[PDB]
Amino acid sequence: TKLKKHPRGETEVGATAVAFSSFDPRLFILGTEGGFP
């Protein structure tokens, strides 16, 4: 399971899609609803 910037407040980090780089299992981007990747 937790990405939250300034937890316990107006922080609801939801995303619509995620992509992962073939380069490395631990690199990926979250398509946040906020709009800023």
Binding site: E10, E12, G14, E33, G34, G35
Partner: protein, 96 residues
């Protein structure tokens, strides 16, 4: 150009705010009117519907997800959520 385009832009800004104001008012009114009044998880009202289609009459039936989406929308868009909604939203979490 500026005259026309600016007048249009201002109208667009007004459009958004008007739609928002209505949204906010209706949510605050609905909560204060008929949802703050001890909404409970009433059991299935079977006898009312003589078809075995037990009507689980609960104010929270739809409202739970509506409130969660409502606060998500306002938060993402950089709007202030009046306390009244934040309070019932935290309650909604417990029911969920």
């Amino acid at each position: 150009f500026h005259q026309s385009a600016k007048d249009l832009l201002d109208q667009l800004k007004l459009y958004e705010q008007e739609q928002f104001d209505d949204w906010s008012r209706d949510i605050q009114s609905g909560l204060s009117d008929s949802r703050s009044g001890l909404c409970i998880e009433a059991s299935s009202r079977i006898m009312e519907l003589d078809s075995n289609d037990g009507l689980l009459k609960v104010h929270y039936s739809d409202r739970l997800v509506i409130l969660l989406r409502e606060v998500r929308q306002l938060s993402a868009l950089g709007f202030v959520i009046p306390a009244k909604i934040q309070q019932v939203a935290n309650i909604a979490q417990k029911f969920c």
